Design a protein around this ligand. Structure first.
Ligand SMILES: N[C@@H](Cc1cc(I)c(Oc2cc(I)c(O)c(I)c2)c(I)c1)C(=O)O
Ligand SMILES: N[C@@H](Cc1cc(I)c(Oc2cc(I)c(O)c(I)c2)c(I)c1)C(=O)O
Ligand SMILES: N[C@@H](Cc1cc(I)c(Oc2cc(I)c(O)c(I)c2)c(I)c1)C(=O)O
Ligand SMILES: N[C@@H](Cc1cc(I)c(Oc2cc(I)c(O)c(I)c2)c(I)c1)C(=O)O
Length: 575
C-alpha cells in the first residue's frame, strides 16, 4: 500500500540509508557531502512514520515523487551559458527522465589521492559511521551507473580491511595491498554495468533479453528453455530498475532472484552448491561469477532442427520469437568457446536468411547452406585474438599498450587525448587477462572484454562528439561494434595538428613519478606526436620519443631543474 514502508521493511534500515544515499549522489554528483546526508536522514525519518501507519499523510506517494521533491529543495549552481534543463520545473514521469538525463560520465572532480596511512586509521576510528558513508558518496558521484547492490558488497569489504589492519603492528603493509585491489575490481565492475545500462536505454528491451539468453545458456546448459526464460525475465526487470534510478526496488528484486536460484539448483546448475551457503551480499556476488556447468553428453545436431526439418518456415511464421529464441538457446549451450556478441551475430544472420528464403519457391533449397555463412563470422575473431597474444608475449603490457595506442590514434585522430590514452591502456589489459588461458577460453574472455572497453569509448565521446566515424560505429549495431572498429583504416581527411608546447610545461612532480604515472605521461606525449605528424614512420617515432625522454632525463638532475627545462626546451621548439 505504502511503497516506502514496503522497501523499508524488506531491506532494513541499514541498507535503506545506503541505497538512498547512493541514489541522491548519482543524480547530483556536484552536491556537498554533508548536504546529501541531511536529505537522507529526512527520508529515513519520514519512512518510519509510514511504517507506524500506512494511512499517514504522503505515505501513498511514489518513490519518484518523494525522492524528486527532496532533491528540488537545494541544488543551485552557477553559469548556464544559456543552455541548461530545468528538471525541477517538470512533473513526473518527465522529471525523473530529466534526472537520468543529466548523469555525467566524465565530470571534473578532484582526483582522490590517498592521505597518509596513519591518518585514515585516525579517521576510521573517528566517526566510523561518517567514514563509511564518505566511501559510498565519493564513488557513486564518480560512477553514476554503478550497480547499487554490488556497491554495498564493496562497502563491506572496505570496512573489513579497516577493522583488520588498523589493529596491527605494521599498517601500510597490511592495508594498501588490500585497497588497490578494491579499486581495481571496483573499476572493472563499473564499466561492466555501464554496458548493460547502455544496451537497455539505447537499443531496447529485446536486445538485452537476447544478450542474457545467450549468456545464461552457456552458464546453465543442462537447464530447460522454460527455466532459462523465467531467469532472463526476472533479470531484465532488475537491471531495468537499477539503470533507471529505482535502486530500492532493484536491490529488493535481486535478493528475490538469488533466493529462487538457490532453492532450484537441481534444474539450473550443479555449480551453485557453495555460493548458496554464503551470506546475502556474498551470495548474489558468488552466483554472478560461478563457472560454466558441464555440457550434456550426446545432444542432437543443430542442423536437424533448424535446416533439415520441413517445419522450419512454418515454425518461424507461427511463433518467431519462441523459435528464434530456441535457436539461440540451443546454439549457445553447446558453444562455451564462443563469445556472446559472436553468438548474437549468428542468430541475426539466421533470422535474415529465413525472412528471405521462406517467401520464395522451394525454401528448403534456399536456406540449406546457411551454415556456410557462419564459417567466416567465426574465424575472424579467432585469428584476431591469435596474433595479439603473440604480440603481447613478445612485447609486454606497456609496449603492447603503445602499439594499440598508435593505430587507434590513426583511426580516429579527432578523439581527445585523455580519452584516447585511457581507452588504449584498457585495450592492452586484455593480454594480461586472457592470453594466459588455453587457446579455447581466450575469445569468451577477450571479445566480451573489448565490448566493455569500446562501450567506454562510445559514452565518453557522445558527450562531445568530434569524430564522425566513432559516432557511426557506436550507433549502428551493438553486436558489430568490435568488427566495425577493427576494419577502420588510417584516416586521410584529417589535417595535421598544430604544435602547441603548453602540453610540455614543467611541473615539480615529473621528476618523482611512480612507474604507473611515468607510463601515462609518455603515452600522452606519444598521442600528441602522432596527431602532429600523422605520416611519421614508426622508426621515426621512436627516435623522436627517445630524444625527448633523454631531455627530460638530465634536466631532472640539473642544479636548477626549472631553468633546465625552460632553457633546453626552447632549443627543441626552434630546432
Ligand atoms: N559476462 C556476464 C556473465 C553473466 C551475466 C549475467 I546478466 C548473469 O546473470 C546474473 C545474475 C545475477 I543474481 C546478477 O546479480 C547478475 I550482475 C547477473 C550471470 I550468472 C553471468 C556478466 O557480465 O555478468
Ligand atoms: N603483426 C601483426 C599486426 C597487428 C598489430 C596490432 I596494434 C594488433 O592488435 C590489434 C588489436 C585490435 I582490438 C585491433 O582492432 C587491431 I586492427 C589490431 C594485432 I591483433 C596485429 C600482424 O601481422 O597480424
Ligand atoms: N605539463 C604537465 C607536466 C608534463 C611535463 C612534461 I616535460 C611532459 O613531457 C614528457 C614527455 C616524455 I617522452 C616523458 O617521458 C615525460 I616523464 C614527460 C608531460 I606528457 C607533462 C603539467 O603541467 O602537469
Ligand atoms: N620545431 C618545430 C616544432 C616541433 C617542436 C617539438 I618539442 C617537436 O618534438 C615533439 C616531440 C613530441 I614526444 C611531441 O609530442 C611533440 I607535439 C613534438 C617537434 I616533431 C616539432 C617547428 O619549428 O615547427
Amino acid at each position: 500500500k505504502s511503497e516506502v514502508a514496503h522497501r523499508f521493511k524488506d531491506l532494513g534500515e541499514e541498507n535503506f540509508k545506503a541505497l538512498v544515499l547512493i541514489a541522491f549522489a548519482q543524480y547530483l554528483q556536484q552536491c556537498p557531502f554533508e548536504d546529501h546526508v541531511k536529505l537522507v536522514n529526512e527520508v529515513t525519518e519520514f519512512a518510519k512514520t509510514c511504517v507506524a501507519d500506512e494511512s499517514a499523510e504522503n505515505c501513498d506517494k511514489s518513490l519518484h515523487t518523494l525522492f524528486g521533491d527532496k532533491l528540488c529543495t537545494v541544488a543551485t549552481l552557477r553559469e548556464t551559458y544559456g543552455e541548461m534543463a530545468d528538471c525541477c520545473a517538470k512533473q513526473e514521469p518527465e522529471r525523473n527522465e530529466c534526472f537520468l538525463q543529466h548523469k555525467d560520465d566524465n565530470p571534473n572532480l578532484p582526483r582522490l589521492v590517498r592521505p597518509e596511512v596513519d591518518v585514515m586509521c585516525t579517521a576510521f576510528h573517528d566517526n566510523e559511521e561518517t567514514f563509511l558513508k564518505k566511501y559510498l558518496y565519493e564513488i557513486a558521484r564518480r560512477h553514476p551507473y554503478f550497480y547499487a547492490p554490488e556497491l554495498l558488497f564493496f562497502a563491506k569489504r572496505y570496512k573489513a580491511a579497516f577493522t583488520e589492519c588498523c589493529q596491527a603492528a605494521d599498517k601500510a603493509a597490511c592495508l594498501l595491498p588490500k585497497l588497490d585491489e578494491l579499486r581495481d575490481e571496483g573499476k572493472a565492475s563499473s564499466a561492466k554495468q555501464r554496458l548493460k545500462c547502455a544496451s537497455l536505454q539505447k537499443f531496447g528491451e529485446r536486445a538485452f533479453k537476447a544478450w542474457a539468453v545467450a549468456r545464461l545458456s552457456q552458464r546453465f546448459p543442462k537447464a530447460e528453455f522454460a527455466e532459462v526464460s523465467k531467469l532472463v525475465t526476472d533479470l531484465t526487470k532488475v537491471h531495468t530498475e537499477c539503470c533507471h534510478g529505482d535502486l530500492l526496488e532493484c536491490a529488493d528484486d535481486r535478493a528475490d532472484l538469488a533466493k529462487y536460484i538457490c532453492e532450484n539448483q537441481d534444474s539450473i546448475s550443479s555449480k551453485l552448491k557453495e555460493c548458496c551457503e554464503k551470506p546475502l551480499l556474498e551470495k548474489s556476488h558468488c552466483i554472478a561469477e560461478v563457472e560454466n556447468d558441464e555440457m550434456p553428453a550426446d545432444l542432437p545436431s543443430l542442423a536437424a532442427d533448424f535446416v533439415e526439418s520441413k517445419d522450419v518456415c512454418k515454425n518461424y511464421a507461427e511463433a518467431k520469437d519462441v523459435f528464434l529464441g530456441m535457436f539461440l538457446y540451443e546454439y549457445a549451450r553447446r558453444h562455451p568457446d564462443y563469445s556472446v556478441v559472436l553468438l548474437l551475430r549468428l542468430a541475426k544472420t539466421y533470422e535474415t536468411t529465413l525472412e528471405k528464403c521462406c517467401a520464395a519457391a522451394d525454401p528448403h533449397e534456399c536456406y540449406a547452406k546457411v551454415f556456410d555463412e557462419f564459417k567466416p563470422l567465426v574465424e575472424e575473431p579467432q585469428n584476431l585474438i591469435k596474433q595479439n597474444c603473440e604480440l603481447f608475449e613478445q612485447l609486454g603490457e606497456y609496449k603492447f599498450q603503445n602499439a594499440l595506442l598508435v593505430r587507434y590514434t590513426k583511426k580516429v585522430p579527432q578523439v581527445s587525448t585523455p580519452t584516447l590514452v585511457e581507452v588504449s591502456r584498457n585495450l592492452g589489459k586484455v593480454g594480461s587477462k586472457c592470453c594466459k588461458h588455453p587457446e579455447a577460453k581466450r575469445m569468451p574472455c577477450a571479445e566480451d572484454y573489448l565490448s566493455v572497453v569500446l562501450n567506454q569509448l562510445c559514452v565518453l565521446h557522445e558527450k562531445t562528439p568530434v569524430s564522425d566515424r566513432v559516432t557511426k560505429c557506436c550507433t549502428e549495431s551493438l553486436v558489430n561494434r568490435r568488427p566495425c572498429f577493427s576494419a577502420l583504416e588510417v584516416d586521410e581527411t584529417y589535417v595535421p595538428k598544430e604544435f602547441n608546447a603548453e602540453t610540455f610545461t614543467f611541473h615539480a612532480d615529473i621528476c618523482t613519478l611512480s612507474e604507473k604515472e611515468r607510463q601515462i605521461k609518455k603515452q600522452t606525449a606519444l598521442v600528441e606526436l602522432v596527431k602532429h605528424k600523422p605520416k611519421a614512420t614508426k622508426e621515426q617515432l621512436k627516435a623522436v620519443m627517445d630524444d625527448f625522454a633523454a631531455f627530460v632525463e638530465k634536466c631532472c638532475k640539473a642544479d636548477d631543474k626549472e631553468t633546465c627545462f625552460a632553457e633546453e626546451g626552447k632549443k627543441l621548439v626552434a630546432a
